[PDB]
Design a binder for this molecule. Structure first.
Ligand SMILES: Nc1ncnc2c1ncn2[C@H]1C[C@H](O)[C@@H](COP(=O)(O)NP(=O)(O)OP(=O)(O)O)O1
Ligand SMILES: [Mg+2]
Ligand SMILES: [Mg+2]
Ligand SMILES: [Mg+2]
Length: 432
DNA sequence: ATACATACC
DNA sequence: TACTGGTATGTAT
């Protein structure tokens, strides 16, 4: 498959000049400035501050290190090319062919064949077709994916009944308890037939082989898996042998540190495009560099960020799955071809409010904060929020609040019309 | 509390 | 022709 410059070449040539690209520059500059600002303060940092922080951080680091929990076994399962794999399963014509699930405007994912051409999730179809004109863009069938998801979630329930579904295709499992019961199971209880039988051992490696086997037998789709003593690690491992493979970080401190040693921080869940580029500008790329700079980082970043970075640098993370409690927000948003007539924008706001009210009606939810989201034709995004004393829920009450927030924004630019491409409404601040 | 940014599927 | 929908969290004021 294609190189890796030829790709970015095509994307640039196709993106450059678009209102969309304009905005991406506007953001990258707003980030570069944020780096430059950080960069200053690093210069104004003294050696006797550095020493002061270093003795503080290490005091906290000894507290984390002494509390390290290796006694749990955490599994992250992540379906392989989920949507695309499903559409491949049920249409032989795509057998050995590059595909992507989505529209010509936007793609959800792509199969590994198509990923060799640099077509990826969150790419517009029309750009992906320039990277690979044989690409088959198959429309998404959300409802199938939900149904397939339910089939695997049923299997996963056997090993951890409190497993944490992150989305349709992925989940964390705490198999610690299952491995204890399984230690002294007969071959009967861990024997599965092929769709002539097969058997799996008593170890963690084997349990996960059984899970991934049953998943393939039930759904005709492969999954990858990661094993570790915490979620943060397990999530990373699950990606290591993708597609259709496992990895284990064994529950001993040395192994953890061996894995961490040269791990690019980007691979950790929650270090993205920006934090990478920010941490790179301090010379931090691996998770040991992140450890080494821990004093400096305590001065340049907020408490939560450097606390989080320290957990990353020590190979720490969550060692029990907290059963997802109540939601914090519900929202709906929609992109469209340009709208500028005020009366059409009110109507469209009123529609979204109705849809949100209907989704609230499902889970019997009422909130206090209504937040409209507007994104003009140049991709610039405004949110405007208003909190109310008493909780609201109906399409009328939500619209009443959103109406004004929108009105204000139409008035502000007056006599210029709001030229928007996306509107949304969110409700939040639900009671405890 | 409000705004905007960053991240994940 | 065409650049998503969605929830939670962070950063800053
Ligand atoms: N940015 C995005 N926008 C829309 N849909 C997306 C998306 N990212 C993912 N999806 C959809 C499409 C995906 O099928 C599904 C699961 O997301 P993953 O597990 O992150 N990606 P996959 O399973 O395809 O491949 P593998 O894990 O082997 O790399 O969510
Ligand atoms: Mg995934
Ligand atoms: Mg996946
Ligand atoms: Mg990351």
């Amino acid at each position: 498959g294609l190189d890796k410059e030829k790709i970015n070449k095509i994307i640039m040539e196709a993106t450059k000049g678009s209102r969309f690209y304009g905005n991406e520059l506007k953001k990258e500059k707003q980030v570069n400035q944020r780096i430059e600002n950080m960069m200053q303060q690093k210069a104004q940092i003294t050696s006797q501050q550095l020493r002061k922080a270093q003795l503080q951080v290490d005091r906290f680091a000894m507290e984390l290190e002494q509390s390290r929990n290796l006694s749990n076994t955490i599994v992250h399962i992540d379906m392989d090319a989920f949507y695309a794999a499903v559409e491949m399963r049920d249409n032989p014509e795509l057998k050995d062919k590059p595909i992507a699930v989505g529209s010509m405007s936007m793609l959800s994912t792509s199969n590994y064949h198509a990923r060799r051409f640099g077509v990826r999730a969150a790419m517009p179809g029309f750009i992906a077709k320039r990277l690979c004109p044989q690409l088959i863009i198959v429309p998404p069938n959300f409802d199938k994916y939900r149904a397939v998801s339910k089939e695997v979630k049923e299997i996963l329930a056997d090993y951890d009944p409190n497993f944490m579904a992150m989305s349709l295709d992925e989940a964390y499992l705490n198999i610690t308890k299952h491995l204890e019961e399984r230690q002294n199971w007969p071959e009967d209880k861990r024997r599965y037939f092929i769709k002539n039988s097969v058997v799996f051992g008593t170890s963690a490696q084997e349990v996960v082989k059984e899970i991934r086997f049953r998943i393939e037998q039930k759904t005709t789709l492969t999954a990858s898996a990661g094993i570790a003593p915490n979620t943060m690690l397990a999530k990373v491992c699950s990606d290591k042998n993708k597609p259709n493979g496992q990895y284990q970080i064994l529950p001993n401190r040395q192994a953890v540190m061996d894995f961490i040693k040269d791990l690019p921080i980007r691979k950790v869940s929650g270090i993205g495009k920006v934090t990478e580029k920010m941490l790179k500008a301090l010379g931090i790329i691996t998770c040991t560099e992140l450890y080494q700079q821990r004093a400096l980082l305590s001065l340049l970043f907020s408490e939560t960020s450097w606390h989080y970075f320290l957990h990353i640098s020590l190979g720490l993370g969550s060692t029990h799955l907290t059963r997802d409690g109540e939601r914090k927000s519900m929202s709906v948003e929609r992109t469209f071809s340009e709208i500028n007539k005020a009366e059409e924008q009110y109507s469209l706001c009123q529609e979204l409010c109705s849809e949100l009210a209907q989704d609230l009606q499902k889970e019997r939810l009422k909130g206090r904060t209504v937040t409209i989201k507007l994104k003009n034709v140049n991709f610039e995004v405004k949110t405007r929020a208003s909190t109310v004393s008493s909780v609201v829920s109906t399409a009328e009450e939500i619209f009443a609040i959103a109406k004004e927030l929108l009105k204000t924004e139409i008035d502000a630019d007056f006599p210029h019309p709001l030229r928007l491409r996306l509107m949304g409404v969110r409700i939040s601040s639900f009671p405890n």
